[PDB]
Ligand binder design. Structure first.
Ligand SMILES: CC(=O)Nc1cccc(CN)c1
Length: 330
């Protein structure tokens, strides 16, 4: 089997992407944030504290004839931005782009933090990291991909995120029309539960390529590109007036700037992120100070190839017995 679904930016900045997901019988369609940096499929629901729901579409398990309470199971998760959610668990039928999994753990939120409430466009998350990170207790649950894998034509999914435009998540096949040139595959460590790999270096604008190993994760659920402070300083040094602002929480630059591209290495291959992808717009409405799309990972503990990087590529998440990642230009 295969599946194919369109993923759409939630706003004009590509702050996140939402993908429609069918849950239950009859189908309830929710728009979920597909997140290769986590491993829980959780949703706003009829159980979510009422004051914490503001415009999201909710899953109502009592209206699904295939929903079953997973007795005794609970979940609780915290994310890198300080947000969090928790609740109980149902199993139900879940379909993405025509690919159906029966008995999928659907984690129903009883509580969500303010940032989730405040974002009316995201109805929940669909985790696509390794199932070892799943938070359900006392019995850990599998991701949608892990559950689907054995049925897929090939044990893979692909992310093809758009810049200020829709893109595609495919399951079970590689669309050879969706990229240019070849796909370069690189080793993955699953030791931390992530799609963790090592980039071979970087270049800023038209500058020379610096060969250096940068370990990081391919994370569709993170907006920006988080890299070592040395790399990030080298980038922003090429933008007149750019500086790190502790009050804003990262590098900012004059909105009048033209940003240089940023290249990252995948083996001997190179992925070029155009400068415009690195502009996240005014820091507050009407400001002439703009927020940068490349930021330091120093406070985080891990480098993160978030949407800024991934959207510049066609990315293969190869879930074969020894997983790997593939990157192509597009
Ligand atoms: C408030 C909100 O939507 N946070 C979120 C979503 C998806 C992933 C992560 C972690 N990178 C955080």
């Amino acid at each position: 089997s295969t599946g194919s679904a369109t993923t759409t930016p939630i706003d004009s900045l590509d702050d996140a992407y939402i993908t429609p997901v069918q849950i239950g019988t009859p189908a309830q369609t929710l728009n979920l944030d597909f997140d290769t940096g986590s491993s829980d499929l959780w949703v706003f629901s009829s159980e979510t504290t009422a004051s914490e729901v503001d415009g999201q579409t909710i899953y109502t398990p009592s209206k699904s004839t295939t929903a079953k309470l997973l007795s005794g199971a609970t979940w609780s998760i915290s994310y890198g931005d300080g947000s969090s959610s928790s609740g109980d668990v149902y199993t139900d039928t879940v379909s993405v782009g025509g690919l159906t999994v029966t008995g999928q753990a659907v984690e129903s939120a009883k509580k969500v933090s303010s940032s989730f409430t405040e974002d009316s466009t995201i109805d929940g998350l669909l985790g696509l990291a390794f199932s070892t990170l799943n938070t359900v207790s006392p019995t850990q649950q599998k991701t949608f991909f892990d559950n689907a894998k054995a049925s897929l034509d090939s044990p893979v999914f692909t992310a093809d995120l758009g810049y200020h435009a829709p893109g595609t998540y495919n399951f079970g096949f590689i669309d050879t029309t969706a990229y240019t040139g070849s796909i370069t595959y690189t080793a993955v460590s699953t030791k931390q539960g992530f799609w963790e790999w090592t980039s071979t270096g970087y270049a800023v604008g038209s500058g020379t390529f610096k060969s250096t190993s940068i370990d990081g994760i391919a994370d569709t659920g993170t907006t920006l590109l988080y890299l070592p402070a040395t790399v990030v300083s080298a980038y922003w040094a090429q933008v007149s007036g750019a500086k790190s602002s502790s009050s804003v929480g990262g590098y900012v630059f004059p909105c009048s700037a033209t940003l240089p591209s940023f290249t990252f290495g995948v083996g001997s291959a190179r992925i070029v992120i155009p400068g415009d992808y690195i502009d996240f717009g005014p820091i507050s409405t009407g400001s002439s100070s703009c927020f940068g799309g490349i930021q330091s990972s120093a406070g985080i503990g891990i480098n993160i190839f978030g949407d800024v990087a991934l959207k510049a590529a066609f990315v293969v998440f190869n879930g074969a017995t020894t997983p790997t990642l593939g990157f192509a230009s597009k």
